[PDB]
Amino acid sequence: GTGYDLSNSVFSPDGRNFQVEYAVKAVENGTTSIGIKCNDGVVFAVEKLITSKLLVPQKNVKIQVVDRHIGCVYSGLIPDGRHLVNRGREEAASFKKLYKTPIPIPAFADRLGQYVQAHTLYNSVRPFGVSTIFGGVDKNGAHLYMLEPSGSYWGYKGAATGKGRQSAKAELEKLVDHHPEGLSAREAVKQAAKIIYLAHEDNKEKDFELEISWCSLSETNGLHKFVKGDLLQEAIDFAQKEIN
């Protein structure tokens, strides 16, 4: 027949859920954002699109942190991931409440993928319109994960989502080749900044703001934290030079 898409849990005649696939639509539409696992740790980079001067700088913050070691960022409908994020914040809490440890990134990774996939399991459950790049330093190093409304996430040497991901995925692939060694968080900070501007070239039509956060076994000790001030401004001009 037809209209298989018209209800979530339905399998398409080819066995697919177009709703999720449609949810994927706005995901791309979601603000381009990336993440990087550097040598010790991970870095989370996202463009903050400036809609207007009435927006107050730095105030509306995209990247969200789970526990204290896990940052998360997503292209898509903000309230979605937020809603999800809270659940993750719940998850780790329960996890840590039970396990006394902060949660391993992959552990944390898994739990969500279920909860997302749960929203693939019912025609009444609206899949998620977001894909979160997320991770942090954990017991064993860091990890870099981006979870799809499909309920699929993976380990990522680098990760990107939203519009400009291609420009990103380009640059990420490069740095992989530029630095199969690894990367210093600092350069991880710096390079992402360039990538973002480059990624912004798709959305170049409007001005934006740049938000980048990171989790460094070294620099944040394994905490997850924002890039701020000079170091933030550094990568900016570092990129703002390199963009030219």
């Binding site: 018209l6 209800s7 025609n123 009444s124």
Partner: protein
């Protein structure tokens, strides 16, 4: 959304009808013809085993005539399965009623009991009704022998005699023709058998094609005695009709 999938069972016809109820009734037309009669001295129960065969085992088989109590047994027009549900329930209900009052249930109470139960699906739940209607044969203190009926709608009446399943109008005609108030069971027996043989859609009316029972206060009695006839007994009385 779930809405797509609801047949919306209980919704009214624009004419204020319930087609499921209508259609349930319709399947009952397809149900094996079942007849019952309240004689002066008793109540007769005869129904056609429908869809029969050689290796079909008759003796244990009862697909139609079931005993709720020793003062209440019933003939079933409809899905064998569905009734057995209600059959069991009513028994309990009666048993409860018995266990409540240490006294047998006046039949209608049990009847009306099932009546609204059917009606339960009628007015709520989005649940298909039962495709079953019943001949309610019972003896009470109050009215003595009582011959009731029910429809999936739960609407129900008393009868001096009644038929259900196929050929009802035909039977009803024959019944409403040949019946007379003072008829003795054995008359009604053959009378039904007469009506049966005639209203029989198959060639011959034969025991192996029939279920038969009676409610009678015996000659040595004070215990109004229900009896289901054995195939031979049916076959025997089958001869006594001259039907042979």
């Amino acid at each position: 959304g779930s809405r797509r999938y609801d047949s919306r069972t209980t919704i009214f016809s624009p004419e204020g009808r319930l087609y499921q109820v209508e259609y349930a009734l319709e399947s009952i037309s397809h149900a094996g013809t079942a007849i019952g009669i309240m004689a002066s001295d008793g109540i007769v129960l005869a129904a056609e085993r429908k869809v029969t065969s050689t290796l079909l085992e008759q003796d244990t088989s009862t697909e139609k005539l079931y005993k709720l109590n020793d003062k209440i047994a019933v003939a079933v027009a409809g899905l064998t399965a569905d009734a057995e549900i209600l059959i069991n329930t009513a028994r309990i209900h009666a048993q409860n009623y018995l266990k409540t009052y240490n006294e047998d249930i006046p039949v209608e109470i049990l009847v009306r009991r099932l009546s609204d139960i059917k009606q339960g699906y009628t007015q709520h739940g989005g649940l298909r009704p039962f495709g079953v209607s019943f001949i309610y044969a019972g003896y009470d203190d109050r009215y003595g022998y009582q011959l009731y009926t029910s429809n999936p709608s739960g609407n129900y009446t008393g009868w001096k005699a009644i038929s259900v399943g196929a050929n009802t109008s035909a039977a009803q005609t024959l019944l409403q023709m040949d019946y007379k108030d003072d008829m003795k069971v054995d008359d009604a027996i053959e009378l039904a058998l007469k009506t049966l043989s005639k209203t029989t859609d198959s060639s011959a009316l034969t025991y192996d094609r029939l279920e038969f029972a009676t409610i009678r206060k015996g000659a040595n009695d004070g215990e109004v005695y229900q009896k289901i006839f054995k195939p031979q007994e049916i076959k025997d009385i089958l001869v006594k009709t001259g039907i042979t």
